[PDB]
Design a protein around this ligand. Structure first.
Ligand SMILES: O=C1Nc2ccc(F)cc2[C@H]1O
Ligand SMILES: [Cl-]
Ligand SMILES: [Mn+2]
Ligand SMILES: [Mn+2]
Ligand SMILES: [Zn+2]
Length: 460
């Protein structure tokens, strides 16, 4: 045997009743699905959103992909990056001819088992040099969501699906999520991405920014094959990866140079990393859990739509993730503390389970901040001044040393205008004596305790 398929991940078939509320359902399956990292969700037979579009008027700029195991690729950036151009129809014609010519078979007579074995053969063989193309970008005027959105008059059926929880345009900005409260520009993370696939086009092993959840819907076409690893095994996987492809682990100059790669799940299984698989067919959802590594490839021409989200469950993990970024010197997409304080400042209109969970995260934030400020005072930093960090562009408030986005506090020095360090890296700013430094802070401890009290009242 040259490829042993991993065991299958969990598959859920909710009733209409269960399927009514997405967040309730995800909370239900969570103890099972978080053991496997990914899971598949089949909607009720009824639930059939209308996909409709003109294949001649949708155009997009294709990305090109070489298919070599352990070779470095860079995560897709929101920028089009292209002079070349396909309509959905001309891409479909390219994609079907490619698959048909590769196997000398009609496109739907190629078994999924065989495409999977062939994918892993061709990525491991050096002389084979297959390149494929694919589409990836957030919605725009030239290529929009596959779900119904408001604007054009809509049919009664379209109106049914316009407000669904499972309409992925809605899911980021619903109530039991926490990304919706963020006022910062985080386009890449709260807007759905649109993916046009062809045979063998693939996505490298990765986890979502800030260890968020994600959910992917296959609108139409041939299936999408997935591999997933549970969150508790993320560091095992990373150690296996570091050993075999250490170049992917050199320091990131920014978030547009994140390096990722294809790697055979059998390799992971040999090093005792648990891995699960699934084929996602048209009309099905795949959900990924916090810090669950995933990868996959398309069986043929298809169209998927995916979005990030964060439940109240995720809040403690969000804080651990930012700490982990600090240890690695990795850039943040947003400030976690800034998001917590924003929610606290809206305590009266918050859902009450949300208020209760924000309260507990804020209590940890405040006790850590108390300890850090005492430490830098003992270093001889005496002068201080309030500062509205949320007004600075992100690139003007990153720690010089660990790149974290400052919000609660930072240290500055008149000696190096415009530069900041977080309170973990006070000794990294410059060589002036500590009495020349200034502590810049968003809130006094006395501002903070009443903010947390408002949450306590709302939670009762
Ligand atoms: O379903 C997919 N996920 C994903 C992720 C990143 C990519 F560049 C491309 C894809 C799609 O094929
Ligand atoms: Cl190859
Ligand atoms: Mn993903
Ligand atoms: Mn350090
Ligand atoms: Zn720092």
């Amino acid at each position: 045997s040259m490829f042993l398929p991993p065991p299958e991940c969990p598959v859920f078939e909710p009733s209409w009743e269960e399927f009514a509320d997405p967040f309730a359902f995800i909370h239900k399956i969570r103890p099972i699905a978080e053991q496997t990292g990914i899971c598949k969700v089949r909607p009720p037979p009824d639930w059939q959103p209308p996909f409709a579009c003109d294949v001649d008027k949708l155009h997009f700029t294709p990305r090109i992909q070489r298919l070599n195991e352990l070779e470095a690729q860079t995560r897709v950036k929101l920028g089009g990056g292209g002079a070349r151009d396909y309509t959905l129809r001309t891409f479909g014609e390219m994609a079907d001819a490619f698959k048909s010519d590769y196997f000398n078979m009609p496109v739907h007579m190629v078994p999924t088992e065989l495409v999977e074995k062939e994918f892993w053969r061709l990525v491991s063989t050096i002389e084979e040099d297959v390149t494929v193309e694919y589409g990836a970008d957030i919605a725009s005027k030239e290529f929009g969501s596959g779900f119904p959105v408001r604007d054009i008059k809509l049919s009664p059926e379209e109106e049914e699906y316009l407000d669904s929880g499972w309409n992925l345009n809605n899911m980021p900005v619903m109530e039991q999520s926490v990304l919706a409260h963020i006022t910062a520009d985080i386009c890449g993370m709260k807007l759905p991405w649109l993916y046009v696939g062809m045979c063998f086009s693939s996505f490298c092993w990765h986890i979502e920014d800030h260890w968020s959840y994600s959910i992917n819907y296959l609108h139409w076409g041939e299936p999408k094959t997935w591999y997933g690893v549970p969150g508790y095994a993320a560091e095992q996987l990373e150690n296996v990866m570091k050993k075999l492809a250490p170049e992917l682990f050199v320091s990131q100059p920014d978030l547009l140079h994140q390096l990722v790669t294809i790697m055979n799940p059998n390799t992971l299984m040999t090093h005792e990393v648990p891995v699960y698989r699934t084929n996602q067919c048209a009309g099905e959802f795949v959900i990924t859990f916090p810090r669950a590594y995933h990868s996959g490839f398309n069986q043929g021409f298809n169209f998927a739509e995916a979005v990030n989200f964060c439940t109240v469950d995720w809040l403690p993990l969000g804080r651990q993730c930012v700490e982990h970024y600090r240890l690695l010197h990795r850039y943040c997409v947003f400030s976690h503390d800034e998001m917590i304080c924003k929610m606290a400042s809206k305590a009266d209109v918050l859902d009450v389970v949300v208020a209760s969970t924000v309260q507990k995260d804020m209590a940890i934030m405040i006790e850590d901040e108390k300890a850090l400020r005492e430490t830098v005072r003992k270093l001889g930093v005496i002068d201080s001044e309030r500062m509205d960090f949320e007004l600075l562009p992100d690139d003007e408030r990153q720690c010089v040393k660990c790149k974290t986005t400052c919000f609660m506090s930072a240290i500055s020095c008149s000696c190096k205008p415009g530069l900041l360090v977080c309170l973990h890296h006070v000794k990294e700013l410059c060589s002036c004596p500590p009495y020349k430094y200034k502590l810049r802070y968003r809130y006094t401890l006395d501002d903070l305790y009443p903010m947390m009290n408002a949450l306590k009242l709302r939670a009762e």
